[PDB]
């Protein structure tokens, strides 16, 4: 079911936001201000809390709970702080019907520099439903950009 390169989803943000939406009162939109690949990335703005960010639903048919998968996205920011800590996380619902977050990867970086959020061997909890991959920063509300968001078979190598 994955593509040639073992990718289940691959969002370049070149003309489309894919299944990506905003979390919180924020807004996500295509932007040509900066890009990692191509001419555009996804801009995340109007954040008022750190927990605000960008998210994308995961199909339970494709991403089977209890199994391992590779997730990757590149992120950067331009202004608002001297540094930040990006978090890519799994937002999901557990066996008790309560929403939880599980960290997939996190990276600290300065302004104007792409950083690679990456985990080729992330295990999705077995009791997980209503899953979303979720990107945010740890402790601020700056605008930020993401590009090349990928979800792939476990062990997939992304440089
Ligand atoms: Ca792009």
UniProtKB/Swiss-Prot annotation:
Residues 5-154 form the CBM-cenC domain. It comes from the Bacteria. Belongs to the glycosyl hydrolase 10 (cellulase F) family. This is Endo-1,4-beta-xylanase Y. It comes from Acetivibrio thermocellus (Hungateiclostridium thermocellum). The lineage of its organism: Bacteria, Bacillati, Bacillota, Clostridia, Eubacteriales. The chain holds residues 561 to 719 of 1077 of the full protein.
